[PDB]
Structure formats: structure tokens, C-alpha cells
Amino acid sequence: MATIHVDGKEYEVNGADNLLEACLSLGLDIPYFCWHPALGSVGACRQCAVKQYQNAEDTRGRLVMSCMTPASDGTFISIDDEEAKQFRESVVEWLMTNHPHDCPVCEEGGNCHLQDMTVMTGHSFRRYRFTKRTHRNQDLGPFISHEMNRCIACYRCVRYYKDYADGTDLGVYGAHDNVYFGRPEDGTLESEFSGNLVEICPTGVFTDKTHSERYNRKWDMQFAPSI
Amino acid sequence: ELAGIKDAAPDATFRIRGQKLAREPHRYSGRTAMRANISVHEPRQPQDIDTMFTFSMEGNNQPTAHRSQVPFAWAPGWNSPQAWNKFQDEVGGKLRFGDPGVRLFETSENGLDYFTSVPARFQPQDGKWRIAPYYHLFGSDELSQRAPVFQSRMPQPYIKLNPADAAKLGVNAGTRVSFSYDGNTVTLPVEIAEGLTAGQVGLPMGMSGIAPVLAGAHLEDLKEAQ
Amino acid sequence: AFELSAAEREAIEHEMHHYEDPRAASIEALKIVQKQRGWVPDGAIHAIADVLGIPASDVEGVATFYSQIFRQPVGRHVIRYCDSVVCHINGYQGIQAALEKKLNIKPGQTTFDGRFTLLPTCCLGNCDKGPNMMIDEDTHAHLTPEAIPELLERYK
Amino acid sequence: MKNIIRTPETHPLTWRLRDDKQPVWLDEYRSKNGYEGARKALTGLSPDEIVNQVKDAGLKGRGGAGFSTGLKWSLMPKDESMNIRYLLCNADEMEPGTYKDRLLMEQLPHLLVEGMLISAFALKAYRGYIFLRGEYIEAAVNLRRAIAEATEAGLLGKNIMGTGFDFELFVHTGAGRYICGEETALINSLEGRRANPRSKPPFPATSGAWGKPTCVNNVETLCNVPAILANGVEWYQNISKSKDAGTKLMGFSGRVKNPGLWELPFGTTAREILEDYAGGMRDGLKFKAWQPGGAGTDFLTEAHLDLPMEFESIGKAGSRLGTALAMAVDHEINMVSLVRNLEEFFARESCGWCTPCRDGLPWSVKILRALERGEGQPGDIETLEQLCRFLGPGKTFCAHAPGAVEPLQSAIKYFREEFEAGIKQPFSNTHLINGIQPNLL
Amino acid sequence: VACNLCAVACPVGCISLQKAETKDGRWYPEFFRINFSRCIFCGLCEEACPTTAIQLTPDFEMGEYKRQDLVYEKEDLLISGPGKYPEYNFYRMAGMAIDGKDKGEAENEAKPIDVKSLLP
Ligand SMILES: Cc1cc2nc3c(=O)[nH]c(=O)nc-3n(C[C@H](O)[C@H](O)[C@H](O)COP(=O)(O)O)c2cc1C
Ligand code: SF4
Ligand code: SF4
Ligand code: SF4
Ligand code: SF4
Ligand code: SF4
Ligand code: FES
Ligand code: FES
């Protein structure tokens, strides 16, 4: 349908799709947090940045977001452009400024999308020396435990719970860096599809309480396809 | 009529270019320490004859392996459920080589006739109460209500009455009210349901005591509990 | 045991006529409740939610996003002093030190009496006429620290 | 200077101001050439020719971007079936140093009512909303009383002036957030939602308030059009011999002899504004720097005075014209404190939607506090440079972030001596651990 | 803290453990099992551990009549003091809240600010 040029190479992609699902369909690793195939693109996390040129001869273009840009015919992008790589690493670092020192005691450890994107960008050196912001937690039922310190404000939870699932009792509160995701008051999440948050949230804010009684890491699990 | 089940999954002689399909991640740990408290010798990994899968990590779980039955998603650099993007042809589409499962029956060439069995309108009866089924996600299933984590998630058993039916009966919310089914006697606390139409009695089906066969049945006797 | 009074409801449904959707009136509805009580109590979130026909998490999100909507108990008067850049050039720090010396309560706190709750704020739109403050619905410009006690006297 | 011959020709918006500073109502407003523009518009002109006239006049938005008003009004759809359209007036004015619309709404409310009536007739909008700030109380009383005064003269309501046009005006006050001034976040605030901005495209001209065609315009943009229609477009282009047409409310603020606001045409240089209109700095203080257009604008030096106040003239000078309301910074204000206050404001007013604003700005403010107290570490200046580089246009979700970092990068670029005079301590973010020898760089 | 990193980082797989959690919220191992018949003393477990809980001491004195008695449980491994690093405590760093450590009582952590605070 459409032909795109990525880092000099040429590929065949669907024109209706955006650039993130086009490049992910070709096996090109672009980091992302806020995009989900079911939920769509909103452009919040700014993690999926790629360098876009106007044509083949433009050497200096602009950083765009691949989830928010259509994969039209004639697109010239560079995932591995140095400025794009520096920007994506900087975004990971800005998310890392307030993250708690919890991976040994996090139930998402070994199954955490943030860990994967942090390694994929290659950010391993801390420069931030100041205090970290903290939040108190809420009780969200017998099924889901809550640890708001680990939130990266990707907005996947509210976009899944209100738009997709039409739940009413989960929202975002506050402003600036004090955004709080949860219920107005403690109490069991009433939705019949609340537990998908454990997959939807890319960090360990919403975790399975039934699994945390007898926890083990993902590499120690034995899996089979079942119904 | 069950001829399609051969194509639901391959047989136990199916191999990914000579490899058995793995059940375990390749970095599975502790294989010489799980059973070291019973016997310090290592038992042999169970052999599998039923399925193509092996009860070990010595197998195949490549994203591009020519198969439809994928036990779990993992890719280098993708440890999360987002590794499912590596297993699809396009992201958000279908599995790369097809989703497992086959439909047993196709659409028939010709249809049916019109059913001429039109029911009469519902009429309440004195004495007889129609049982209106109420279903709960956490109560109606036989196996999952025995999960301990649902014991707090299930509500208390309740019998739902129209406000007019509780006004003629003389009861309110919380008044235990005994009834009789099939010569047995069951007592449960009362709840008020405005949307429930009169002549009916709402019961939660599939609970401990209220079988789902009771749908469309009749309660001969209903009286205040003492 | 919170109940929304019938005149707050009459004003909310009066201002609900001016939109396609009642959600658009939610902010104004919250201000009406604050006008009656100084601040928005916790039960007013569910009251507003059930009258407007929107979820309570949307009302609480709106109320927490906007600074002027208060979700914690406030004092009799809300001192709102500007601490923005033009007031930084004109010397608000002396006004802050005078106010917080007199009241003795650092900014964001409440006086033992509760007569005054000191709060900093953004630019009040009166930048050219010097350091500015607002007490309730009254704006005072050309502020000097010496004038602070007498100004306090006005509000007893 | 203190005596100025204010004429209808050179001060079309502000020549109606009385000496006692009290507002002018509809009986006094119509005696001094009031609403004749809206009569000739409703009775004599079609909406499309009015839009073409406003495009030919070359009216630009006074909200701080300077986009052409007639082209934006021509972005509206050409489909009659879409008969539900809205006109929204951005009267928020929460940016520090911006006090211009307060004068227009407190003292000349019928100018705004007439301008929105004309703009609504051009845009075919049946309903108009004035998005007033909720701190401006006397502006809201005077606006609603003047609106209720105009409803009995047949200028609002049903069958206004005999034509079929139906326009209904409303005033709704805000709840006090700066991001509500962004036009898509103004549309979201009007809908009763958290005032996050929206992704562009689509534009509000097609999908705006409640998914209807919408056009958000600054107060002064709407107040300029009655002058255009009453006097004429031919008068309007020939006010100034400059690439920007019409008059602007320009002023100078800070600790100067006469801080204030005066309507002036475009192309006035800073020297007359500062020393002829504002009377210069107070005695015994010398001039260090000036921001041309509020807090979001870049700092400028003494060499950048004597330079015209145009969008493209200030644009090639390294800054942005913004609201055109200037700020004086003198020699006794420490620049680090000024930048720290600015970043405190911008950081604390972030809506929280996008990562590089929500998390970058708190880091920048904490670094600035460390520099101000004198505990700054040697990696701080390159971190501020990196923050300004990666917060530029197109990398964040809206334009609050580039506007937040423009003063920071200009103050580091021109005044690096003060910023680098608070680095008296070396870099250490780790504590020694006994039994583990560290990695020695 | 039963982080299971030592078990996975061991090349021979000689560590088995299960996480437990107190009502206080402190992670601790329900059981810890090291098979010393197979252990080669490579020290990858010590360097994998992010809490310094597991360490290698200068003591080679081992010998047994039965191989079944070479499997060490937690009571054979847990010593009365801190070993090589007397002062490091991991929970002081960690964000998770335990007794004596409410939210904001960690290193380089500010106090929790509620969304309902009057300050904007
Ligand atoms: C953070 C931010 C705040 C803004 N605040 C205002 C404002 O307070 N008043 C205003 O007129 N425009 C403001 N704008 C500009 C508007 O987005 C928009 O460009 C303007 O209202 C267009 O109207 P105009 O054509 O009359 O200038 C702001 C923009 C941003 C990015
Ligand atoms: S949630 Fe993810 S990033 Fe956060 S501590 Fe746990 S594993 Fe690490
Ligand atoms: S709680 Fe989870 S899904 Fe929601 S914003 Fe935080 S990380 Fe994203
Ligand atoms: S860039 Fe900052 S101000 Fe703009 S939408 Fe994102 S978080 Fe809000
Ligand atoms: S603390 Fe050390 S010994 Fe305990 S589980 Fe973690 S890595 Fe293994
Ligand atoms: S020292 Fe022993 S337990 Fe540790 S990694 Fe080596 S073999 Fe495994
Ligand atoms: S995932 Fe694409 S911008 Fe956030
Ligand atoms: S900038 Fe200080 S009150 Fe407006």
C-alpha cells in the first residue's frame, strides 16, 4: 500500500497504520510506553521519538513521534539517528529520576516493560542527586495491589479503564508531577475487567495480589498453552 | 461431526525442524535444587507422549517458528507482554502462522422455519412465585467459587423482591424470609429490587444452595422467618 | 451525612442550561458548593456526580486539577499573595516575611484561630501596580510591609 | 509622555476611556460611535465577504502567536449542514506580566461584546462563550451587567436588528489554571474536563468544542474587528508603514518611573517606550535586561533596544514578541533568583500530560535552587543546557515547555558568569560503602 | 529479601528458595536450600546479590558421610552478624514501606504530598 524509507532501507507498510506499528511490524525495535495496539496512540510518554526528514536529500529534519505520525507513502525516517537516540535516553532518564529503589522487592521484576526499555535505550548512569517524590497507596480490592511510587504516568490505566472498558471508578488526580492514578477512596475496583491492568500497566503499580501470596519470578515459571 | 478436532492442534510427532516445543524458559533455574530435600539425586525429566511439548527447557520457542501453539511470549530485549508484538505478523493483528483452533461447522445452505410457538403474557399467581435468575461473575461457576480469594469477593446470599411484593408481604430490607423448594426449606435475608417486576423472586443462581436448574421454577411457600 | 441543599441544586440546574452536556457545568457547580462552604467536602464529590450524571472520579479529577477548588479545610479568609516574576522584581519577599511573621504560620498552613489561611498564588493580573494580594474577593495593590497590620485590622 | 493627544484615528480601541477610569455603558457607548459597525455588518454584509475583509486587513492574533486571523477564520468548513458552530474568546490572561485584557474587559466591555457579535456573524456561530478568568471579579460583573444591558436594545437574543441571525452570549469564569490559556486545553476546560491539550491535527476549526467547528480568539483580536468595520479596511492598512497592521496594546512594567500600558502602533522601538512613555528606570538604578513579551519570552540586553516591536523583527533577534508587554530587570536583582522563580512558576503550572515537561522542569528548578544557595555541582550547567536543548519545539506535547525554557537558555547564554559563580562544590551523588572499593572514574 | 537473583545467576542451579512476606510487609525467604554437593564456589551468587545477603567466607571445612546431608537449609546458612559489610542495609534505600520506615523515610526521598494539598 505504502513504501517507507527507514535508515536508508525501504519497506512495504500499510498506509492507514501509524509509524510505530509499521516499524514494529517490520521487527524494528522502537521503545514505547503510552501506545497500545488496542488503545491507540495519544502521544503522552514521548518515548517513541524518531528523526523524520522531508525527503531523501534533507539531512537535518525534526524529531517526531512514530505513534502519532501516519505511515504515508514517501516517509523518510531514522530510528538510529544520534539525536533521536539521545532524546530517547534522556526521556528514560527523566522517568528514572523519581523511580523507587524497589526492583528486588517489586513483583514486576523480570516482567517489567520499564526495565526492558531502560536496557534497550542503554541508560545505566545516574546523574540526578536530589530528593525523590513519594506517594501513599490505596486498597483496590482482594485482586490488585497498588504501589503508586512506581508509576511513570503513561496514562494507559485511565485510557483502558474509562475509554475501552467503560469503568467509572478509576481516574487521574492532581497536576504537574503529583499526578495520582487510582480511586477517589479505597474500595474494591468494581469492574469485571479490572485485572487486565496488571498487563496494561508497564510498571509494578498495579500487581496481582493472588500471585504475590506465592510469588516467583517469570524465568522460574513453567508455561503451557491452555484454555 | 467432530472431525475437525484433528486440525485444532498438531499431533505428538510434530517438531520445529526436529525440536520439541519448549514449556520452560531457557534461563529456568534451580534444576538441581528443587527436589534436593527429598532425594539428593536428580530424577529424570518426565517424558511426554501426549503432546509435542517437552517438560523441560530444551526445545523451541522462537518467535518465527512455524507453529500456532505458543506457550509464552519472550524475545531478546522484550521480557514483558509486549513481546507478543514479536509473535504477530502485524502488531494488533493475528498470529504469524494462524491462530490455533478450527470451526467445526460451516454456515448451512438453507435455514429453518418460523417457530409458531408464541408464548402468552406473564401473569402472577397467588402462592406460586416465578424464580428470576440473577447471575454473578464470582458465584455462578462451579470450580471458581471454591477459590479462597473469591470468598471475600462474593456477596452475601440474597433474595430479591419487588417493593410492592415486600409491602404486601410486610417485610423490608434485611428481614430473613424462609421459602420452600421441592419439600426443602431455605432461609435467606431479603433485598429490595425496584426494577424486578411483580410476581417474581430474584435468586442468585449457582451459589451454595441455589442450583441454576431453579431457573423458571416455582416457589410454593414463602413466609417470614422466625 | 452530607446533603446538597436545594438552592445549590437550583443554581446548578440553572447553569446546566447553558451547555450541550452537563459535564461542562461541573467546574461551575463545584464553585457553587465552595461559595456556600469555603471548600468542597468529600461528600460533595458524590453529590455533584449524581446530580450531573458523570462519574465521581471525573468530578474529583476536575477538583484536584484546579488550584482554586479546595479539597482540604480552609480558614475564614484566604490570603492569596502574588509571588510571580513582576512581584519578585517589586519585592514580594518582604510582604511574605511580614505576613508570615504577624500570623506566624508558614505558607500553606492555618492559624490556630483559623481566621486566615495564607496561600501563595500565580500572577493576579495587576502586575504594573506593584506587589499585590487578595483577601477573599478584595484586591490590594501597592503593598508595603508597614501596611500589613492595619490591612489585617480591616478583616478583624 | 504624560500628555498625549488621544484621537479616534490613532487610538481606535482606547480613545473611549474616561478620566475617572469608570466603565462606559451602552448609552454612552452609542453616543461616541458605538455599534454602527455591527449594524452595517448585520444589515449590509454577508459573512463570507466579512471574512475576506478581515483577511485583507491583515489582522493577526494578539494572544502571543501572531497567526493571521482571516486565514484561520477561512479554515472553517464550507458545509452548510454543519450548522452547530461555537465562538470562544480566550480571556484567561494568567501569564505573568500580562494585564492588558483586564483594562478592555473592565472599562470597555461593549467593545468586546460588539467584536464577538461581528466575529460570530462572520463565523455563523449561534453561541458565544467568553472564557474569563475567575480571579477577575469586577470584569465579570461589568461584563455580565453590560451583556444584560445589551439584551434589551435588540443586539442579542432573538431577531437581533430584524435579521435572521441568532446569537446568544455567555460569560463563564475559570477555576485558575494557566494551561487553560492554551486553546485546545481551553476547549477541554470548557467541556468540563481536565485541561489537557489536544493533538493537532485535527484543528478546532473542524473538530472543536463538543466535536463542533470552533474558533478560539484572544480578547484583543475580537476587539480589533469593530474598528475595522466601522472605519474601513482602507484606513486599517495605512495606520503604520510597517509589515504589521493596526494598533497593539504595548506597555512596560517593573520598577520604572511610570509602569503602565499604552496603545501604540507596531514598529515602535524600545527607547521611546522605556524613556518617553514609561519615563525610564528609577533614579540610582541602571538597566540590565528586558523581557519583551512576558515571562515566556527570551531575555534581552541593552544592545537589543532601539529595535522595532514586530513578530519577525524580534524573531530574528533571538526572542519572541509574545504579548508585547515588556519587563525591566535592573542591576540589583540576582539573575539566578529570577530564573529560579520563573522555572518554579512554569514547573508548578505544568498540566502533567507529557514526560519532558512534567519531569524536566522540576529537575531544572532543583538545579537552580542549588545554584542559588551555592551548592551547585560541576555537572549542573551542562544539565541545564541539555534540558533546554531537548525541550524545544515539537518535542513536547504543547508550547508551554519551549516557552518555559526560552528565558532559561537566554539567561544562561548571555549571563553565564552568575550561573557559573555558584559552583563551589564538586560532584558527588554517592556515599562510601565499607568493603566495596568504588569505580574510580 | 528472596529476590531470586542468586538462584538464576548460578550457572549450575544449586539454589532453591521461596519468598515469604510478613504482615509487616518485609520480604524474606520461606525456605532457602543450597546443594553443596554441586556447588563449585564460583562466587557468581555473591556478586549477583543486590543486598549483600549471601556471601563467601574463608572457611573450607566441609566433609560428610552422606550426600543427603550436604544440602544446607536456611538455619545452616543464616549467621548472627553482618559479615564482610557491617553497615549496609537495603531497606533504608528501598521505597517499600516497612515498620520504622513510613513513606518518605528512605534515602534521598521527599515527604509524600497529597493531591488535596492547598498549595498549587
Ligand atoms: C501554555 C500556553 C498558554 C497560553 N495562554 C494564553 C492566554 O492566556 N491568552 C491568550 O490569548 N492566548 C494564550 N495562548 C495562545 C493560544 O494557544 C492561542 O494561540 C490564542 O488564543 C489564539 O488566539 P489569537 O489568534 O487571538 O491570538 C497560550 C498558549 C500556550 C501554549
Ligand atoms: S516496577 Fe519495574 S522498574 Fe519499578 S522497581 Fe519493579 S521492576 Fe524495577
Ligand atoms: S499506574 Fe501504571 S498504567 Fe497508570 S500511568 Fe502509572 S504506570 Fe501507567
Ligand atoms: S508539555 Fe508540559 S504543559 Fe504541555 S501538555 Fe505536556 S505536561 Fe502539559
Ligand atoms: S537477597 Fe541475595 S540471597 Fe536473597 S534472594 Fe536476593 S540475591 Fe538471593
Ligand atoms: S558459588 Fe555455588 S551457589 Fe554460588 S553460583 Fe557458584 S555454584 Fe552456584
Ligand atoms: S508511545 Fe508514541 S509518543 Fe508515547
Ligand atoms: S505578576 Fe505579581 S501580581 Fe501579577
From Swiss-Prot, chain B:
Superkingdom of the organism of origin: Bacteria
Protein location: Cytoplasm; Cell inner membrane
Subunit relationships: Composed of 13 different subunits. Subunits NuoCD, E, F, and G constitute the peripheral sector of the complex.
UniProt record similarity statement: Belongs to the complex I 75 kDa subunit family.
Reported function: NDH-1 shuttles electrons from NADH, via FMN and iron-sulfur (Fe-S) centers, to quinones in the respiratory chain. The immediate electron acceptor for the enzyme in this species is believed to be ubiquinone. Couples the redox reaction to proton translocation (for every two electrons transferred, four hydrogen ions are translocated across the cytoplasmic membrane), and thus conserves the redox energy in a proton gradient.
Protein name listed in UniProt: NADH-quinone oxidoreductase subunit G
Species per Swiss-Prot/TrEMBL record: Escherichia coli (strain K12)
Residues of the full protein shown: 682 to 907 of 908
UniProtKB/Swiss-Prot annotation, chain C:
Top-level EC class as recorded in UniProt: translocase
Keywords: 2Fe-2S, Iron, Iron-sulfur, Metal-binding, NAD, Quinone, Translocase, Ubiquinone
Residues reported in the UniProt entry to bind [2Fe-2S] cluster: C82, C87, C123, C127
PROSITE patterns the UniProt entry points to: COMPLEX1_24K
Superkingdom field: Bacteria
MF annotations from Gene Ontology: 2 iron, 2 sulfur cluster binding; metal ion binding; oxidoreductase activity; quinone binding
Pfam families: 2Fe-2S_thioredx
Entry-linked CDD domains: TRX_Fd_NuoE (cd03064)
Record EC number: 7.1.1.-
Record text on subunit structure and interactions: Composed of 13 different subunits. Subunits NuoCD, E, F, and G constitute the peripheral sector of the complex.
Known role: NDH-1 shuttles electrons from NADH, via FMN and iron-sulfur (Fe-S) centers, to quinones in the respiratory chain. The immediate electron acceptor for the enzyme in this species is believed to be ubiquinone. Couples the redox reaction to proton translocation (for every two electrons transferred, four hydrogen ions are translocated across the cytoplasmic membrane), and thus conserves the redox energy in a proton gradient.
Family: Belongs to the complex I 24 kDa subunit family.
Protein name per UniProt: NADH-quinone oxidoreductase subunit E
Organism: Escherichia coli (strain K12)
Gene, per the UniProt record: nuoE
Swiss-Prot record, chain D:
Record-listed NAD(+) binding positions: G61, R62, G63, G64, A65, G66, F67, S68, T69, G70
Positions with a binding annotation for [4Fe-4S] cluster: C351, C354, C357, C398
Gene Ontology molecular function terms on file: 4 iron, 4 sulfur cluster binding; FMN binding; metal ion binding; NAD binding; NADH dehydrogenase (ubiquinone) activity; quinone binding
EC number, as in UniProt: 7.1.1.-
Catalytic activity: a quinone + NADH + 5 H(+)(in) = a quinol + NAD(+) + 4 H(+)(out)
One Pfam match: NADH_4Fe-4S
Entry binding sites for FMN: 174-221
A single Gene Ontology CC term: membrane
Domain of life: Bacteria
Alphabetized UniProt keyword annotations: 4Fe-4S, Flavoprotein, FMN, Iron, Iron-sulfur, Metal-binding, NAD, Quinone, Translocase, Ubiquinone
Matching InterPro entries: NADH-UbQ_OxRdtase_51kDa_CS (IPR001949), NADH-UbQ_OxRdtase_suF (IPR011537), Nuo51_FMN-bd (IPR011538), Nuo51_FMN-bd_sf (IPR037225), Nuop51_4Fe4S-bd (IPR019575), Nuop51_4Fe4S-bd_sf (IPR037207)
Protein family (similarity comment): Belongs to the complex I 51 kDa subunit family.
Subunit and interaction comment: Composed of 13 different subunits. Subunits NuoCD, E, F, and G constitute the peripheral sector of the complex.
Stated role: NDH-1 shuttles electrons from NADH, via FMN and iron-sulfur (Fe-S) centers, to quinones in the respiratory chain. The immediate electron acceptor for the enzyme in this species is believed to be ubiquinone. Couples the redox reaction to proton translocation (for every two electrons transferred, four hydrogen ions are translocated across the cytoplasmic membrane), and thus conserves the redox energy in a proton gradient.
UniProt protein name: NADH-quinone oxidoreductase subunit F
Source organism (scientific name): Escherichia coli (strain K12)
Swiss-Prot record, chain E:
Cellular component aspect of the GO annotation: membrane; NADH dehydrogenase complex; plasma membrane; respiratory chain complex I
Compartment(s): Cell inner membrane
GO molecular function: 4 iron, 4 sulfur cluster binding; iron ion binding; NADH:ubiquinone reductase (non-electrogenic) activity; quinone binding
Residue sites binding [4Fe-4S] cluster 1 per the record: C3, C6, C49
Key word Transit peptide present: no
Cofactor note: Binds 2 [4Fe-4S] clusters per subunit.
Keywords: 4Fe-4S, Cell inner membrane, Cell membrane, Iron, Iron-sulfur, Membrane, Metal-binding, NAD, Quinone, Repeat, Translocase, Ubiquinone
Major enzyme class: translocase
Cofactor(s) the protein needs: [4Fe-4S] cluster
Domain named 4Fe-4S ferredoxin-type: residues: 1-20, 30-59
Membrane topology: Peripheral membrane protein
Gene Ontology biological process terms from the UniProt entry: aerobic respiration; respiratory electron transport chain
Subunit structure: NDH-1 is composed of 13 different subunits. Subunits NuoA, H, J, K, L, M, N constitute the membrane sector of the complex.
Annotated function: NDH-1 shuttles electrons from NADH, via FMN and iron-sulfur (Fe-S) centers, to quinones in the respiratory chain. The immediate electron acceptor for the enzyme in this species is believed to be ubiquinone. Couples the redox reaction to proton translocation (for every two electrons transferred, four hydrogen ions are translocated across the cytoplasmic membrane), and thus conserves the redox energy in a proton gradient.
Protein known as: NADH-quinone oxidoreductase subunit I
Organism: Escherichia coli (strain K12)
Organism lineage string: Bacteria, Pseudomonadati, Pseudomonadota, Gammaproteobacteria, Enterobacterales
Gene from which this protein is expressed: nuoI
